[PDB]
Design an enzyme around this catalytic site. Structure first.
Site, short mmCIF file in Angstrom:
data_model
loop_
_atom_site.label_atom_id
_atom_site.label_comp_id
_atom_site.label_asym_id
_atom_site.label_seq_id
_atom_site.Cartn_x
_atom_site.Cartn_y
_atom_site.Cartn_z
N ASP A 32 9.54 13.04 -5.66
CA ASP A 32 10.14 12.38 -5.25
C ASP A 32 9.16 10.70 -5.72
O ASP A 32 8.17 10.82 -6.63
CB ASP A 32 9.35 11.91 -4.02
CG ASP A 32 10.05 10.74 -3.50
OD1 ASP A 32 11.26 11.16 -3.15
OD2 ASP A 32 8.91 9.64 -3.00
N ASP A 35 9.02 6.92 -6.61
CA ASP A 35 9.53 6.39 -5.68
C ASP A 35 9.34 5.07 -6.75
O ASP A 35 7.87 4.23 -6.66
CB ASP A 35 8.14 6.17 -4.45
CG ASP A 35 8.32 6.74 -3.73
OD1 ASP A 35 10.25 7.70 -3.96
OD2 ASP A 35 7.85 7.14 -2.79
N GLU A 77 9.44 1.38 -7.43
CA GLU A 77 9.74 -0.04 -6.86
C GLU A 77 9.29 -1.14 -7.89
O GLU A 77 8.45 -1.60 -8.03
CB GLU A 77 9.06 0.22 -5.80
CG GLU A 77 9.35 0.61 -4.08
CD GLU A 77 8.09 0.31 -3.44
OE1 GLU A 77 7.73 -0.69 -2.62
OE2 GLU A 77 7.86 1.32 -2.76
N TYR A 103 13.35 -0.42 5.23
CA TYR A 103 12.23 -1.41 6.13
C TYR A 103 11.42 -2.14 4.84
O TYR A 103 12.51 -2.18 4.12
CB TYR A 103 10.80 -0.25 6.99
CG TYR A 103 10.40 0.88 5.31
CD1 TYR A 103 10.04 0.65 4.79
CD2 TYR A 103 11.27 2.21 5.71
CE1 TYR A 103 9.75 1.44 3.66
CE2 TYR A 103 10.35 2.95 5.48
CZ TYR A 103 10.06 3.51 3.74
OH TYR A 103 9.35 3.93 3.18
#
Ligand SMILES: Cc1cc(N)c2ccccc2[n+]1CCCCCCCCCC[n+]1c(C)cc(N)c2ccccc21
Ligand SMILES: Cc1cc(N)c2ccccc2[n+]1CCCCCCCCCC[n+]1c(C)cc(N)c2ccccc21
Ligand SMILES: Cc1cc(N)c2ccccc2[n+]1CCCCCCCCCC[n+]1c(C)cc(N)c2ccccc21
Length: 570
Positions: free
Chosen positions: A290, A292, A294, A370
């Site tokens: 995965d 991530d 950012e 979120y």
């Protein structure tokens, strides 16, 4: 006719062997601490105190011959190699020219990182987590964090595994530029610097090997000589209990993303992707990877980094190159490997990547619906709303309008729906999108009634700074509080508000809050009702399912509400 060998247990490392060699009593560079071997080195000392020793020994596992060598005295060390993990019944025989004499059998252990030498994990889950029978085809994912075993005291056996299809393990760092990690304070940067000693830039490492494979957990039956311990041995044993559970390392995250901005250079991608392959061959309980990052184009923790022209194509080529490597692993192992990614969903994040292109290589996109609003500034809003809340100005929702200074909005507001719609609009299929739920709130102090523009909506106020609180109340950092703390110290058993807090719900936004009028503490979060809304939303659109961050901060309520919402969608 020699004396039958007796095994020296303590001189044979208690018969605990391993294809993986792990430093248990030091903290050093990843390549020194972790070495995977195709063949486990086995070393077994045995004694023949009385009578004659004979001249040759044979070693048996489960009645099958696996080694031979010379006996030349009353004490022998048998060293040999064995390729397969598991538990076996070992016998050693001594022979001379007249016959052989076998030791009584004894259990030898050979650890492997699939957990082949392990029993199904014994669970200790809060019983507030309910039983459901949710179609196993719907994604129900969550993040489990490596550092949660410290102050938060939340360990692998605490996860309600049967309510989960996917466990994302947060987080795996990348060696190289990591100034963002330094700015966070504590020991996080120092630990990373140590892990990366003697490691090339752009390779993955374990951040905290103590949490990962050194710490002894009694609930898991760990002992001094257990060759693999920590979160990872428990995850291996968890796979024994729940063989269809996907467990996937999550690389990067908000603070560990600096190295991705150099993936514009393919040499650095090559290095990374190779290191990810070796990681998955070393740590076999893991079912894919995965990413991530950012974020492509920037606007993340790294203020000086981000390339809106090249980051998006780097991300796409990263996904293709990971998928090529994963196909190699599927070929070599016969397993299925997954490729996934958690992403920002503000319009300004989404626009810097062609996800329709990227997703062709990918199994799922975890839509980070979120952190839309939070204590990083003094503007209250719904951190995880589905839709535009009542506090928004005209033309703010779609980005048509102008702000309180008369300045045009630059794009649609930060809501889940705006994010999912934008992704659908690029051409991403709905069945690859996973919608995110929050198991934590963000919040502020100083949002008192005199700051409101609508006296019934605290989302119309102005704060003085970040929520403050103690770790007993679930506040591990300013501006952020576990859902389970919100429930214990603000909502109370009936969900009507305790200790000076009132509950409110914005029906237009599908977002709850708890607000203290005198302190002006305001907290935005997900609750039972907003999560039912999100499950209904995901169902209407044929989204792959739901995921959550982070499992330790829930009491059972959020994950329950995730299963209820996905059944109940109308
Ligand atoms: C929790 C857990 C605890 C164990 N000792 C356990 C032991 C063996 C196998 C599974 C186990 N799991 C379950 C493994 C986790 C899967 C997540 C689903 C949670 C289901 C919990 C089962 N549950 C229990 C045991 C006791 C209760 N009074 C209750 C009351 C209401 C609802 C459920 C309840
Ligand atoms: C008790 C103990 C006992 C030992 N024998 C021991 C031995 C060696 C090293 C540490 C040891 N420790 C404890 C030392 C723990 C620090 C070492 C690992 C650093 C990884 C940093 C990640 N991280 C952390 C850690 C904490 C957070 N809140 C956080 C919040 C948000 C994001 C990341 C976060
Ligand atoms: C996104 C981002 C994320 C970070 N972790 C961050 C950390 C340090 C400095 C800036 C950061 N920036 C933003 C860097 C500035 C460019 C964007 C202009 C203002 C937006 C600032 C948003 N913002 C701030 C300040 C701090 C946060 N903890 C935060 C956490 C989650 C989401 C957003 C957040």
């Amino acid at each position: 006719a020699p004396t039958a060998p007796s095994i020296d247990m303590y001189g044979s490392n208690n018969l605990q062997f391993s294809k993986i060699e792990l430093a248990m009593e030091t903290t050093s560079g990843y390549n020194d601490m972790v070495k995977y071997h195709e063949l486990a080195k086995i070393k077994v000392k045995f004694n023949q105190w009385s009578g004659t020793s004979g001249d040759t020994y044979n070693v048996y596992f489960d009645g099958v011959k696996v080694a031979t060598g010379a006996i030349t005295g009353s004490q022998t060390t048998a060293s040999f190699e064995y390729g397969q993990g598991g538990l076996y019944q070992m016998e050693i025989e001594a022979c001379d020219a007249t016959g052989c004499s076998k030791s009584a059998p004894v259990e030898i252990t050979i650890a492997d990182t699939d957990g082949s030498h392990l029993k199904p994990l014994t669970m200790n889950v809060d019983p507030n987590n309910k039983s459901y029978n949710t179609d196993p085809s719907i994604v129900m994912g969550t993040y489990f964090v490596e550092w949660g075993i410290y102050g938060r005291d939340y360990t692998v056996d605490n996860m309600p595994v049967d309510n989960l299809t996917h466990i994302l393990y947060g987080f795996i760092p990348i060696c190289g530029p990591n100034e963002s990690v330094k700015s966070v304070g504590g020991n996080s940067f120092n630990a990373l610097q140590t892990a990366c000693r003697g490691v090339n830039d752009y390779e993955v490492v374990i951040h905290d090997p103590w949490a990962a494979y050194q710490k002894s957990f009694p609930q898991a039956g760990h002992e001094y000589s257990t060759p693999i311990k920590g979160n990872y041995a428990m995850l291996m044993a968890l796979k024994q209990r729940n063989p269809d559970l996907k467990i996937i390392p999550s690389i990067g995250g908000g603070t560990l993303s600096d190295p991705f901005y150099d993936f514009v250079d393919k040499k650095n991608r090559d290095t990374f992707v190779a290191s990810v392959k070796k990681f998955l061959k070393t740590w076999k309980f893991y079912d894919g990877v995965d990413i991530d990052w950012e974020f492509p184009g920037g606007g993340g923790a790294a203020a000086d980094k981000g390339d809106p022209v090249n980051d998006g194509p780097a991300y796409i080529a990263l996904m293709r190159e990971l998928r090529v490597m994963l196909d190699e692993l599927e070929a070599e192992t016969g397993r299925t490997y997954e490729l996934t990614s958690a992403i920002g969903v503000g319009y300004d994040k989404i626009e810097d990547v062609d996800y329709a292109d990227a997703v062709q290589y990918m199994d799922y996109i975890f839509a980070m619906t979120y952190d839309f609003y939070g204590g990083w500034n003094n503007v209250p809003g719904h951190q995880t709303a589905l839709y535009c809340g009542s506090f928004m100005r005209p033309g703010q929702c779609d980005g048509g309008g102008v702000d309180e200074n008369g300045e045009p909005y630059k794009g649609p507001a930060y809501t889940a729906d705006n994010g999912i719609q934008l992704l659908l609009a690029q051409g991403v299929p709905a069945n690859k999108l996973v919608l995110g739920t929050a198991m934590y709130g963000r919040g502020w102090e100083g949002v008192t009634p005199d700051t409101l523009t609508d006296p019934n909506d605290p989302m119309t106020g102005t704060a003085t700074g970040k929520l403050k609180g103690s770790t007993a109340q679930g506040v591990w950092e300013d501006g952020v509080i576990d859902y389970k703390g919100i429930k214990s110290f603000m909502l109370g058993a009936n969900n009507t508000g305790i200790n000076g807090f009132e509950y409110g719900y914005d029906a237009q936004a599908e977002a709850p809050w708890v607000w203290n009028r005198s302190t002006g503490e305001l907290i935005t979060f997900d609750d039972h009702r907003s999560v039912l809304a999100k499950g209904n939303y995901a169902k209407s659109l044929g989204l792959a399912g739901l995921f959550s961050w982070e499992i330790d901060a829930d009491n059972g309520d959020i994950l329950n509400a995730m299963h209820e919402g996905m059944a109940g969608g109308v």
